Amino acid sequence: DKGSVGIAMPTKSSARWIDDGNNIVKQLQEAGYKTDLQYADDDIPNQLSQIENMVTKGVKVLVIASIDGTTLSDVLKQAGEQGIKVIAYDRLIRNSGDVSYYATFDNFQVGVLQATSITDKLGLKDGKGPFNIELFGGSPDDNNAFFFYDGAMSVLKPYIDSGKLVVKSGQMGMDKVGTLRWDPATAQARMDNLLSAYYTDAKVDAVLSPYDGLSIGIISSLKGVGYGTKDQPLPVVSGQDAEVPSVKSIIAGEQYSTIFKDTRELAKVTVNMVNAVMEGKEPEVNDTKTYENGVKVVPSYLLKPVAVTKENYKQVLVDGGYYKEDQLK
């Protein structure tokens, strides 16, 4: 037979990975492969055990979206010893030469888009400012978080340097703005304490949020101190993943933007890679320079993300079939 593919997803607490998993499995099975899809509920030891089982089971290919890829070094070595090819899915797996390919969206560009939605809304290109902004990052054990952050700062930093953007808290850098495990409650708490320490007098004009789940928590915090009223509008808040609650928030004129990353397209890239490996061919890659993982630069294929606001949500999210119309009502 064609062989089996082991698919390891990190959690279901962030909505996308259910879609990733469903789409990867649907497309792999259509392609004639057997699949073993597992979700780790954000438990690092359990994800490792799940991957060990796939290796022991003798899958031909592993597709892994890791909570913390650095913990997988030994199991990926074992996979390599058995001739199993490893595709890092969405998040780069670091500290392992046993990672063959990396399928993802253009993570730096995601950051550029997140920051640009904010700077465009604030009218910074038109010389407006100063405005107060606070920064959030993803989980520091997620290689993507650094790219989202760096991508955003490529747009933001020039305005911070010129004073047209002011980080009133002074908190910058992933070691200070990172949100462990991409946890909304954590981000909401940080927002609470940013507001009380730095914005009891002044107002926040924007918040760089790298993920929809965080955006919603950040917004709750802001409403907690009086934002989101007619007199006092919410600051401009970005996002990622186009989760339903965030899309509803955008439609309602609350959260400002998000980033659409079509998991159907990422699954398709993944199936193309699996097919190539099975056929003894080289997978198509479009970036062999960016994704250093500590041991090597993993050959990667990057998909182009799409910024979404209340202006384009229908065309981007509904007309293209990602969601049904009624899901957003």
Residue with smaller CB distance to ligand BDP, 147 or 227: 147
Sole residue written with tokens 């792999």: 28
Number of residues located near ligand BDP, criterion CB under 6 A = 13
Of 136-144, 185-193, 270-278, 291-299, which part binds ligand BDP (CB under 6 A)?
Answer: 136-144
Taking the complex as a whole, how short is the minimal distance between the CB of residue 175 and ligand BDP, in angstroms?
Answer: 18
Q: Which of 98, 106, 142, 205 binds ligand BDP (CB under 6 A)?
A: 142
Which residues from 306-325 bind ligand BDP, rule CB under 6 A? none
- Phi, psi angles (nearest 5°) of residue 259: -125, 120
The 10 Å Cβ neighbour count of residue 174 is: 17
Which residues from 186-215 bind ligand BDP, rule CB under 6 A? 211, 213
Question: Rule CB under 6 A: is residue 39 a binding residue for ligand BDP?
Answer: no
Of 124-132, 137-145, 285-293, 306-314, which part binds ligand BDP (CB under 6 A)?
Answer: 137-145
Q: Which two tokens stand for residue 75?
A: 């199991």
Distance CA 20, CA 92 (A): 16
Question: Rule CB under 6 A: is residue 134 a binding residue for ligand BDP?
Answer: no
Q: Which of 20, 68, 90, 254 binds ligand BDP (CB under 6 A)?
A: 90
Taking the complex as a whole, how short is the minimal distance between the CB of residue 138 and ligand BDP, in angstroms?
Answer: 6
Q: Which of 5, 6, 9, 16 binds ligand BDP (CB under 6 A)?
A: 16
Distance CA 247, CA 237 (A): 12
Our measurement of the distance from residue 63's CA atom to the centroid of its chain's CA atoms, rounded to an integer in Å, reads 17
Question: Rule CB under 6 A: is residue 89 a binding residue for ligand BDP?
Answer: no
Distance CA 206, CA 134 (A): 7
Residue with smaller CB distance to ligand BDP, 90 or 205: 90
The 10 Å Cβ neighbour count of residue 192 is: 17
CB-based contacts of 326, cutoff 8 Å, min separation 6:
none
Distance CA 16, CA 133 (A): 27
CB-based contact 171:211 (threshold 8 Å)? no
Our measurement of the distance from residue 250's CA atom to the centroid of its chain's CA atoms, rounded to an integer in Å, reads 18
- For 36, left (φ over 0), alpha (ψ -120 to 50), or beta? beta
Distance CA 17, CA 8 (A): 10
Question: Rule CB under 6 A: is residue 240 a binding residue for ligand BDP?
Answer: yes
Taking the complex as a whole, how short is the minimal distance between the CB of residue 241 and ligand BDP, in angstroms?
Answer: 5
Residue with smaller CB distance to ligand BDP, 60 or 261: 261
Q: Which of 6, 9, 14, 260 binds ligand BDP (CB under 6 A)?
A: 14
Query: What x-and-dash track marks residues 250-289 binding ligand BDP by CB under 6 A?
Result: -----------x----------------------------
Burial status of residue 215 (CB atoms within 10 A of its CB: 0-12, 13-18, 19 or more): buried
Which residues of the chain form contacts with ligand BDP (CB under 6 A)? 14, 16, 90-91, 138, 142, 144, 182, 211, 213, 240-241, 261
